[PDB]
Design a protein around this ligand. Structure first.
Ligand code: CL
Ligand code: CL
Ligand code: CL
Ligand code: CL
Ligand code: CL
Ligand code: NA
Ligand code: NA
Ligand code: NA
Ligand code: NA
Lengths: 255, 255, 254, 255
């Protein structure tokens, strides 16, 4: 009997670090991704990553039911939520641009917890992890849609911890920034963030560790939280951003 | 000339405290409310509060447009947002119950700012105030929809402050709890909160001031922020909750 | 006729607090290190005939002197200052942190410790600390000053929980980029309004792209001390103009 | 090659969980304690815990120097700081009661980092962990000294992360509450917190997981952070408090 995890949007953001490290820790890892609606994309992923179990199901209720049918139960949920950040002055958005952000970044993790929480509560075990964003900690101007939706997700995780603790289910939010996402455009691909001088310099300026975060670092945190080694952190919002933000110092002070 | 303010949902939550004090400060206060769809309700309100200017418009763009047409411009927006709090374990909600909360508590203030920001930015003046909630500061268990949507609104306000400051527009969020709402059910009506002993005792336990907050206190803060006397607070989330939460102390320690 | 105390009145948030509290009708007893000298006290008294400078320096003696002269202390504005010294952590002396915590934590604690009994007995009073917004977004190499200010913020918030039962609100106002006119604590006119590089820095790091004014600080102090919005008790106010502005990605405009 | 850790006040608070788990992870763990001034107490500890290395040094600079001399360097500092919480109304404290709290809970971790940072910066490696408190997250009334000093330490850790990241040195604060401390009075000994029904009931009410945190959970987090597996969390303040605080709900709602 292996523990079963679900990682959503596995090709993007914190998906690969989460899935790879959870598998290394002995989980069966069912993986969701928009591309897995296509048989060829699902099978290519299954061939490259024989330790992972890509699923074709897209919608929350269908995904939870399919993983429960295939593997018995869902022990760990990693809601690795993504949406394209679009920078606009507030008056240049359409209201639908905010609705799109809240559907992808708040309603979707809510729907996944809504669909899985009953089976976890009945057996009094489970772990729920949202991958959110550190942007609420220090917003950039002109990203009001994405940034506020991510904060809704952070508070959703914290609020859920208060009710699910009675059932021995920890709930966590991991909010990254400057997390290297390799080939994925969500949100710091190798090109340009490791390849272009202006981007390399920006990352050195705005993070304390002066580098991007790695998929391994994100995955190590995900597997540590899912292990049951430190459930007493339930309710935490983790800022996985390398010491971002670095705050501009007065004139004359060095870099 | 007169400064013009908009107070939404004026019959509820922080509506009357805001509208009455803004009018005392010399604003023309255009008032929105769902009941003003009915001519008899609008006219009854106008007769009781002849210093206030109730509008029939319901949707955010049409409300901004109607106030702008009637009075020239909108100087102060008070987005007094409401939604009925419904307590449920996460798995007992419908997903639509979260969508309803986000629409009412996040999308609506976004849409109002989206509709009014251009006119404020063009003249480089204006004030934006969201009435949100202090529940994200200390969530109750089983209120995950309402609580997380309110946090999204708080971050929306803070994020907007970063872009609108360049146009001399402060943005504030006032997050109440235990605010006496008189005859309004949103969220602490006189009955039961001043009349039933168990409720009086609860409020004495969980607030530092051991009382409900008053509409006058809320209105004083709204008019102070709208006055242009302290624009340098832009980006603040105010916790208007009387020292809530009081945290349960160890056995043997007194009330 | 309500009585206020404003400490370190020549510096930081002192003048804005004292001037606006007097405009609101308070008798404003003013403390300052320079008032140990009669000539400096009397010059201040002549320039500001609406203010009442005191010579007393230590917390117990100051509270006692104001209570004797004016009956009671209704409003305490602990306007605390210390010179920010930037060092790598290993280049400080431990005494440099001790000095910061004495000036920025122990001192407001001692003033509340000295005045709280009289406020509690009559169930009225207002306590305001002027602290700092540096904990909200620390600069590197200011660990002493920044962490002491955070201690003061939590002290205010913790005190609100016990003093609310006695109808005494407690607030912390944490500024940054507050114009301090001729005081070096912490943004004097020269260089912050006069040197182009400093003007440009303020435009970059605040959302309102300017220093905050003494009038804005004083308006908040008088508003809180008025009893018009006691239900904010426990608040830490970030009076920093939308600071911090967070550096955006390459190619995005200023 | 063996990494070297220092755990202070090892007999108390998070001392044993930290030291035991770091030793299991392969660190040489030098241990400080006030009782180690006595040769008999140091030797008794060495006999019971032969995998740990108790030191007699008491003062911060002399402790760093003694561990560096004995083992070559200090790779991990765990500043496990303690002070007896004394509840008083603000006017009943002596000012010295606050000075004692700041000296023990702020000056002491500062002094330890001040003494060790140069050797870490020179080799561009090291980890700094403060064990602080979650009391600033939700203060009890009448504990203003201890609570505010702990907040100063949390900010000290966060501020230090901004400068030490350039040297590849993460800085963390772990702020517990309701951490079972076994035989130590700091701060939740087995008697009364597992033996007396009133105390057992209090813990069930005020934490989401309805139990004390374990030394194992604390030690797992300390060893995880010190492993270099997730340096990108630098600057984090961890709330290790089981979902504390639970916020009192309205009359009529169940516990
Ligand atoms: Cl990221
Ligand atoms: Cl309310
Ligand atoms: Cl004196
Ligand atoms: Cl300042
Ligand atoms: Cl503890
Ligand atoms: Na399939
Ligand atoms: Na009409
Ligand atoms: Na004198
Ligand atoms: Na020795």
């Amino acid at each position: 009997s292996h523990a079963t995890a679900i990682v959503t949007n596995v090709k993007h953001f914190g998906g690969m670090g989460s899935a790879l490290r959870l598998s290394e820790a002995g989980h069966t890892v069912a993986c969701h991704d928009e591309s897995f609606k296509q048989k060829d994309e699902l099978e290519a992923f299954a061939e490259t990553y024989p330790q992972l179990k890509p699923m074709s199901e897209q919608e929350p209720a269908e995904l939870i039911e399919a993983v429960t049918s295939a593997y018995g139960q869902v022990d760990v949920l990693v809601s690795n939520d993504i949406f394209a950040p679009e920078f606009q002055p507030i008056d240049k958005y359409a209201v639908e641009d905010y609705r799109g952000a809240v559907e992808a970044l708040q309603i979707r993790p809510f729907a996944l917890v809504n669909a899985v929480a009953s089976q976890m509560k009945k057996r009094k075990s489970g772990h729920i992890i949202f991958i959110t964003s550190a942007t609420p900690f220090g917003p950039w101007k002109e990203l009001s849609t994405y940034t506020s939706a991510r904060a809704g997700a952070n508070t959703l995780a914290n609020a859920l911890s208060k009710e699910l603790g009675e059932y021995n289910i920890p709930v966590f939010a991991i909010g990254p920034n400057y997390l290297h996402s390799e080939d994925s455009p969500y949100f710091y691909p190798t090109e340009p963030w490791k390849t272009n001088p202006e981007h390399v310099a920006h990352v050195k300026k705005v993070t304390a560790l002066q580098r991007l975060g790695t998929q391994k670092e994100l995955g190590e945190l995900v597997a540590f939280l899912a292990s049951g080694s430190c459930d007493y952190l339930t309710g935490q919002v983790f800022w996985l951003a390398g010491g971002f933000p670095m705050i501009e110092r007065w004139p004359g002070m060095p870099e």
